[PDB]
Amino acid sequence: RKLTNPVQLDDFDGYIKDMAKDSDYKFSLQFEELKLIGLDIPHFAADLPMNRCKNRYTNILPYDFSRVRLVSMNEEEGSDYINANYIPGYNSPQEYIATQGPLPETRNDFWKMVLQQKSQIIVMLTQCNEKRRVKCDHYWPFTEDPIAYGDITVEMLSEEEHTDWVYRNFRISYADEVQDVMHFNYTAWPDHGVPTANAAESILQFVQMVRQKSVKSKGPMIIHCSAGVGRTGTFIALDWLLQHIRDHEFVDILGLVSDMRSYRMSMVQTEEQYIFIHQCVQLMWQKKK
Amino acid sequence: LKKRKLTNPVQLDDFDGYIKDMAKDSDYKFSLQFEELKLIGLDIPHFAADLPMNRCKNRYTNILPYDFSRVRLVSMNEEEGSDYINANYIPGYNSPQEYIATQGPLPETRNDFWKMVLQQKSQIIVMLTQCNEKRRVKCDHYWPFTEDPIAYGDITVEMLSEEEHTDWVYRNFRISYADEVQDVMHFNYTAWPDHGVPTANAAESILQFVQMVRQKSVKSKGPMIIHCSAGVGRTGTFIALDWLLQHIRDHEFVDILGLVSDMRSYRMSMVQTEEQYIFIHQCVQLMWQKKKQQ
């Protein structure tokens, strides 16, 4: 089916309450359907034998149509491959790019994609390691002296670390093409599960922050986490909603997530993140002051 | 829903036996493959093509381009569909986006066509339809009638030489914008009826035409723009024939099913009829040529 369920913001408070009744009954009903969306969309380039070492998780693959293909002077197989997908935005198509966390083996491909797409913004929603589990390579420089990742060099002009997130100003270049890239790393993600922390504002400050800097990245805003679908998806939804609530008096979270999954699988992976989005949609309380 | 990657590479020496088997039981297998080919890309977005103002730019309401592979016009216009044109990049035997598959230009998307031609640096155009077939409108005569330069919006086109042949015609145009100048060859095959195929008598004809366009392929910077009416059936069988000409040359096998299945994921209806899908196989007995020359 085609998922959609617009709700007037004036009734959103009652709505989510009615969604949680009977042990999140309605919620799991909608989410369970979200799990079906896009289950039969080809991702043949992802299945290719020599691309397997480029897919972090054997089961989180990019659809063929929405995949961000790299530009190489031909040859080989899967030479244009990177586990990434364009995701529609509130302002235009291919507004975002949802990728998995780069691997020691797809590290150079990542920076190649940042340049070829002219993405001047990267949002990282996970730490390299969490609870003694590898989640993402540290694909960027550890210091200020430039590191050459393939043909693209990377120079971290500055590294600003805060309490919940971290900012980095990189300056990558190829041949005679210098390009700036801002990097925001949310490190205090609410575990992922739960949630709680009335301070869901912390994620909202982060979103607002990235958002108020989007007016600089001609290319897509590259967002990623580990698999690039669970937290990545929640983020994108929030960056959408933030704007959509600002300009409308209704929100269709179901449609939103449904939209996103048609472009990349598992976008917003758990019923917890999906309910968390509604918890955050209390952005209405604020739109009332 | 579809979930299997269609493909069936057949060794050229077993082609006679393979096409024989595909023809058994009144083309039983040719249908099995074709019916599944028809499922491809059915669930691929094409919103740009549905925008209110792009509707008049679509020759047919049921033949639209997929968002991911569509060709975009560049311009300052900040209005709806300003970058739109019913066209898709189609992978190549040589490179992705080696061709551009479009519908025949409409009187109202004509200027858009030439813009694409210059912006993509397409120096070759393959038109597989007559502007009119049996009193039915198939494609606008979007190009000049005389050697007199004609301004199509911001691009003037001057027809340099016109050569009307048996089953086809050749034309060399020089288009320009400001100082930017570009030569473009135009190959019009007029013996391919819409929704159909050349006659059994034009079998050699069309293959010679593909040969002629293949020799020139190299002289073009951008993708070869090939088009017909809806830009999918005749345009799809051509792109396939061009591939196979090259592949058959350097290889010992063909995978027509994978080829067509491939094209169809970049633009809908590529190789529209089962008859055209089979025509391709008959043509693949291009091995005849191979086995001879050498």
Percentage of residues in helical conformation of chain A: 25-40%
Anisotropy-based shape of chain A: globular
Please give the CATH class of chain A: Alpha Beta
How far do the termini of chain A sit from each other?
A: 38 Å
In which order are the strands of the major sheet of chain A placed? 2-3-11-4-10-9-8-7
* Total count of domains of chain A: 1
Stated plainly, the CATH topology of chain A is called Protein-Tyrosine Phosphatase, Chain A
Oligomer: homodimer
Instruction: Determine the number of helices of chain A (DSSP H or I, runs of at least 4 residues).
Output: 8
What would you report as the Rg of chain A, rounded to the nearest angstrom? 19 Å
Question: How much of the sequence of chain A is in beta strands?
Answer: 15-25%
Structural class of chain A: alpha/beta
Taken in chain order, the helices and strands of chain A follow as: EHHEEHEEEEEEEHEHEHHH
Q: Using CB atoms under 8 Å apart, which protein chain pair has the greatest interface?
A: A-B, 15 and 18 residues
Sheet of most strands of chain A: 8 strands, mixed
Q: What is the total tally of β strands of chain A?
A: 12
The second-level CATH architecture of chain A is: Alpha-Beta Complex
* CATH homologous superfamily grouping of chain A: Protein tyrosine phosphatase superfamily
PDB class: hydrolase
Keywords: Protein Tyrosine Phosphatase, hydrolase
Assembly: dimeric
Entry title: Structure of the catalytic domain of the chick retinal neurite inhibitor-Receptor Protein Tyrosine Phosphatase CRYP-2/cPTPRO
